[PDB]
Scaffold this active site. Structure first.
Site, PDB file in Angstrom:
ATOM      1  N   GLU B  46      42.018  27.256  54.502  1.00 46.20           N
ATOM      2  CA  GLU B  46      41.393  27.883  53.347  1.00 46.20           C
ATOM      3  C   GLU B  46      40.927  29.289  53.698  1.00 46.20           C
ATOM      4  O   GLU B  46      41.277  30.254  53.022  1.00 46.20           O
ATOM      5  CB  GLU B  46      40.189  27.064  52.880  1.00 46.20           C
ATOM      6  CG  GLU B  46      40.503  25.634  52.456  1.00 46.20           C
ATOM      7  CD  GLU B  46      41.487  25.557  51.301  1.00 46.20           C
ATOM      8  OE1 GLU B  46      41.579  26.535  50.531  1.00 46.20           O
ATOM      9  OE2 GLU B  46      42.158  24.514  51.153  1.00 46.20           O
ATOM     10  N   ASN B  50      42.544  32.820  52.621  1.00 42.16           N
ATOM     11  CA  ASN B  50      41.744  33.766  51.839  1.00 42.16           C
ATOM     12  C   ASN B  50      41.865  35.170  52.428  1.00 42.16           C
ATOM     13  O   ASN B  50      42.067  36.135  51.691  1.00 42.16           O
ATOM     14  CB  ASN B  50      40.256  33.361  51.798  1.00 42.16           C
ATOM     15  CG  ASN B  50      39.969  32.282  50.764  1.00 42.16           C
ATOM     16  OD1 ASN B  50      40.821  31.968  49.939  1.00 42.16           O
ATOM     17  ND2 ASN B  50      38.759  31.718  50.799  1.00 42.16           N
ATOM     18  N   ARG B  98      45.881  30.102  41.329  1.00 46.82           N
ATOM     19  CA  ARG B  98      44.664  30.028  42.132  1.00 46.82           C
ATOM     20  C   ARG B  98      43.920  28.766  41.733  1.00 46.82           C
ATOM     21  O   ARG B  98      43.734  28.510  40.548  1.00 46.82           O
ATOM     22  CB  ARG B  98      43.765  31.234  41.852  1.00 46.82           C
ATOM     23  CG  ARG B  98      44.415  32.595  42.059  1.00 46.82           C
ATOM     24  CD  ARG B  98      44.587  32.924  43.533  1.00 46.82           C
ATOM     25  NE  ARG B  98      44.903  34.337  43.735  1.00 46.82           N
ATOM     26  CZ  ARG B  98      44.127  35.346  43.336  1.00 46.82           C
ATOM     27  NH1 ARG B  98      42.977  35.102  42.706  1.00 46.82           N
ATOM     28  NH2 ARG B  98      44.498  36.602  43.566  1.00 46.82           N
TER      29      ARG B  98
HETATM   30  N1  LIG Z   1      38.560  37.151  52.803  1.00 49.17           N
HETATM   31  C1  LIG Z   1      38.418  37.468  51.478  1.00 49.17           C
HETATM   32  N2  LIG Z   1      38.650  38.753  51.077  1.00 49.17           N
HETATM   33  C2  LIG Z   1      38.509  39.081  49.786  1.00 49.17           C
HETATM   34  N3  LIG Z   1      38.133  38.250  48.782  1.00 49.17           N
HETATM   35  C3  LIG Z   1      37.891  36.970  49.188  1.00 49.17           C
HETATM   36  C4  LIG Z   1      37.994  36.498  50.465  1.00 49.17           C
HETATM   37  N4  LIG Z   1      37.678  35.145  50.478  1.00 49.17           N
HETATM   38  C5  LIG Z   1      37.384  34.856  49.268  1.00 49.17           C
HETATM   39  N5  LIG Z   1      37.490  35.887  48.445  1.00 49.17           N
HETATM   40  C6  LIG Z   1      37.209  35.894  46.924  1.00 49.17           C
HETATM   41  O1  LIG Z   1      36.691  34.602  46.521  1.00 49.17           O
HETATM   42  C7  LIG Z   1      37.523  33.987  45.461  1.00 49.17           C
HETATM   43  C8  LIG Z   1      37.405  32.495  45.608  1.00 49.17           C
HETATM   44  O2  LIG Z   1      38.107  31.979  46.756  1.00 49.17           O
HETATM   45  P1  LIG Z   1      38.482  30.428  46.785  1.00 49.17           P
HETATM   46  O3  LIG Z   1      37.334  29.567  46.494  1.00 49.17           O
HETATM   47  O4  LIG Z   1      39.217  30.175  48.067  1.00 49.17           O
HETATM   48  O5  LIG Z   1      39.550  30.355  45.554  1.00 49.17           O
HETATM   49  P2  LIG Z   1      40.935  31.059  45.334  1.00 49.17           P
HETATM   50  O6  LIG Z   1      41.451  31.540  46.668  1.00 49.17           O
HETATM   51  O7  LIG Z   1      41.793  29.871  44.819  1.00 49.17           O
HETATM   52  O8  LIG Z   1      40.770  32.126  44.304  1.00 49.17           O
HETATM   53  C9  LIG Z   1      38.872  34.625  45.714  1.00 49.17           C
HETATM   54  O9  LIG Z   1      39.691  34.564  44.535  1.00 49.17           O
HETATM   55  C10 LIG Z   1      38.497  36.105  46.099  1.00 49.17           C
HETATM   56  O10 LIG Z   1      38.236  36.914  44.906  1.00 49.17           O
HETATM   57 MG   LIG Z   2      41.723  30.260  48.644  1.00 47.61          MG
END
Ligand SMILES: Nc1ncnc2c1ncn2[C@@H]1O[C@H](COP(=O)(O)OP(=O)(O)O)[C@@H](O)[C@H]1O
Ligand SMILES: [Mg+2]
Ligand SMILES: Nc1ncnc2c1ncn2[C@@H]1O[C@H](COP(=O)(O)OP(=O)(O)O)[C@@H](O)[C@H]1O
Ligand SMILES: [Mg+2]
Lengths: 115, 132, 132, 115
Positions: B46, B50, B98
């Site tokens: 995860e 990300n 997503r």
């Molecule tokens: N390393 C990262 N860099 C930039 N944005 C991030 C990062 N990790 C998380 N995010 C932000 O948090 C949101 C939520 O992440 P997550 O719960 O994994 O759901 P998803 O990846 O399905 O959108 C992402 O859509 C992004 O906008």
């Molecule tokens: Mg994710």
């Protein structure tokens, strides 16, 4: 890392996955499945996860992207032979409420009246 | 005996698997259950995913960095990137293909999750798992 | 597509295995034969073991660092430590439970081997394998 | 990572290894084997490597340390069921010249007259 075996039985698309499903392997699945949904009258989707050894939220995303499609044609999304780990993702995310979980492909097909 | 490992690698999707494998291999030294290993592998996936798709927007030149400190049966997992960052951390933790489940999964499988981020600086996710 | 990985870890003997596994997992992306993978795993083991027992004299506080750059089917493997170093490199490459085969194995299995060292600075071994 | 199964047949010590042999696992082997050589009249050593999946120069060192011991009592060192990879280490190092390699434990024991 992810083998995809597809088969259509009436208005049901059977998706059989083997291997690991993550962001890296999800793309080929999305493309292959959406192609079938475009050139065929599919109302339901049976996702056979018996041979899947791993899945993360990206696996949930590709499934959820399909669910929206199936919901548009009034059909049903069925997942079967789900591992406890994957089952844990369905509970935690509430997906267990909108997607039916069956023991195996046969019961899943029966639930859809195509077996 | 306190063991530590640090891994950095190109922001490529094929490395998602590589990261799962490596961290699991290192955590194995503690003889964890299959379920515990699955959980560790998943949260790594995860966080690493990300960093790749959100932090670096799939740019392979970005570098994803991981640290695993094992001390007193406790696993300290840290995933970081120097990508675009997150404007509102709080909003992002809230459940295009997503699933919006990433953080929730990390929070559920791990015993503690701290997220730090700053726009155009990067993001660092500190996860902790107790009880081997 | 040029992929790179960097791994650092405590100078502990149990990490010898961890290093073999990790580098192999990363090199696997090239679909190498079992024999090629065995060779890679072995040379990693030789170099990493050297850093641990010779470079840091088994002190777990020492940090062993590895880099694997894969570019155009070519594997660039670099193993380094900041240990005691080697006075005479040339003499050391010459074949207590010591087999004195380490460098010879590295030289035979790999297509190129460059050793750099300086007393009380550390040692760096650059290995290269051609043809996936 | 390395299972050690020992057995003595007359003046021959049979060492059966399973797993991986490197600097990390070699120590337990050295201790166990040297203990046997001290409290028993052993002249030969048969090293069964059929279940060994990995070996590096540390494996050669522990073997060579024993060879010196066996050479002191005029005995012989025999290795059997050797993988091609391990065989490659024996050729390259010339160990194939001072240590006998046999197909399996039975032929190895026969070569030593204890079977
Ligand atoms: N390393 C990262 N860099 C930039 N944005 C991030 C990062 N990790 C998380 N995010 C932000 O948090 C949101 C939520 O992440 P997550 O719960 O994994 O759901 P998803 O990846 O399905 O959108 C992402 O859509 C992004 O906008
Ligand atoms: Mg994710
Ligand atoms: N990283 C290192 N730090 C210090 N000395 C080293 C290092 N690598 C190699 N050496 C020196 O080179 C010698 C030869 O190494 P090698 O061929 O692997 O045989 P062995 O480890 O069996 O002695 C070592 O005994 C040591 O003196
Ligand atoms: Mg050595």
């Amino acid at each position: 890392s992810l083998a995809i075996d597809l088969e259509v039985k009436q208005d049901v698309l059977i998706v059989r996955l083997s291997g690991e499903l993550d962001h890296h392997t999800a793309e080929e699945l999305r493309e292959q499945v959406t192609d079938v949904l475009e050139n065929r009258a599919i109302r339901h989707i049976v996702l056979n996860l018996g041979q899947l050894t791993f899945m993360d939220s990206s696996g949930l995303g590709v499934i959820l992207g399909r669910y929206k499609q199936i919901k548009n044609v009034g059909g049903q999304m069925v997942v079967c032979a789900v591992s406890p780990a994957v089952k844990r993702l369905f509970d935690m995310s509430g997906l267990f409420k909108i997607i039916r979980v069956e023991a195996d492909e046969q019961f899943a097909l029966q639930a859809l009246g195509v077996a | 005996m306190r063991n530590e490992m640090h891994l950095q690698f190109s922001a490529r999707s094929e490395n998602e698997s590589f990261a799962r494998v490596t961290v699991a291999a290192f955590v194995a030294q503690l003889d964890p259950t299959m379920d515990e290993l699955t959980e560790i592998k998943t949260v790594v996936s995860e966080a690493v995913t990300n960093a790749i798709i959100h932090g670096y927007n799939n740019d392979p030149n970005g570098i994803v960095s991981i640290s695993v400190i094992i001390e007193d049966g406790v696993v300290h997992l840290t995933v970081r990137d120097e990508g675009v960052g997150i404007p509102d951390i709080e909003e992002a933790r809230q459940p295009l293909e997503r699933s919006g489940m990433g953080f929730t999964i990390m929070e559920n499988f791990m015993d503690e999750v701290i997220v730090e981020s700053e726009v155009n600086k990067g993001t660092t996710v500190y996860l902790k798992k107790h009880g081997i």
